[PDB]
Each structure stands twice: as structure tokens, then as C-alpha cells.
Amino acid sequence: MQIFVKTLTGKTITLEVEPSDTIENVKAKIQDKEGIPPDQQRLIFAGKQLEDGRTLSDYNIQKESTLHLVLRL
Amino acid sequence: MQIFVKTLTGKTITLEVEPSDTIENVKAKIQDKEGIPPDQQRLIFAGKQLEDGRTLSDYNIQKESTLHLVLRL
């Protein structure tokens, strides 16, 4: 499925992910797309921080969902 | 009515509130339920931040609505 991640600067990145893919997989996709480290990226969905062990289906992430990406120092 | 508040840890808290109840009453209920002070608690719902001088009906908060709770340091 297609998902969208918005950064704090308004930049939007579109990625292809599956419901069974974990947040670690989304972090790896973001690292491939932009170069931000997986440990330096924090994912927020519906006002709750996404867990790396939990998957997109566990967080009820559907197609064309919007997530928030935070860059960590 | 019944409302749901989700934190960053994934825990969902169910609260009994009314449309005329202000966000200060919701903060007092959250302080009674979890112990988090109202001064460090921020409520996010429907793309806007909850104001202490506003009510749930002003924010168009209906039954079984989901809000996001942020705990300040």
C-alpha cells in the first residue's frame, strides 16, 4: 500500500509499505528515501508514538495514511 | 457521553464527559484517573489544541471521540 510521511518542515514523502511491515521497515524505507537513520527517526500516528516492534496493521495504519516524522539528534 | 484519550504509550483512558464540559474538567478527570497534572497535560483533537476556556461542544467533540494526550516535562 501507499503511505505518506510528513516531516516537521512540511516535506512529504510517499512510500510503498505493507500492513505486515513493522515500524522498523518504515524507518528502513525512510532511510533509503532520505538518509535519516532509523534510530534518528520517530514515527507518530493519530497522536500516539509508533512502536518499532509493532506493525502498521497493529497501529491500524491503512492505505494513504499520514504519519508524522521527527528527526532525532 | 463516553470519550477516549490515547497517550504516547498506547494506553487508552475512557472518560464520562458532557458536551458542555470544558477542557479544564477533562484535565481534572485525567488528573483523577492517571495522576498527571493539568499544567503538563495537552489535549489534541480534530486538528486543534484544546483550550481551557472552550468546551467539548465548541470543539465538535461527539460520543466515542478519540483525543491525543501529551505529557509535558
Partner: peptide, 29 residues
């Protein structure tokens, strides 16, 4: 919204990292 919550959390984490930098300072000199 998710964006304003993300910005607030980013600003708070930047404050935490600035406190960490101040602690590193107190270690150094």
C-alpha cells in the same frame, strides 16, 4: 493535529538534547 504534536514533541526533545549538551559541558570544563 499530528503535525503540531510532532512539532511540539520535536521542540521538547530538542530541549532535552540541549540539556544533554549542557551536561556534556559540565563534564568537560
Amino acid at each position: 493535529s499530528d503535525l503540531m504534536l510532532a512539532q511540539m514533541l520535536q521542540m521538547e526533545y530538542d530541549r532535552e538534547y540541549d540539556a544533554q549538551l549542557r551536561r556534556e559541558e559540565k563534564k568537560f570544563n
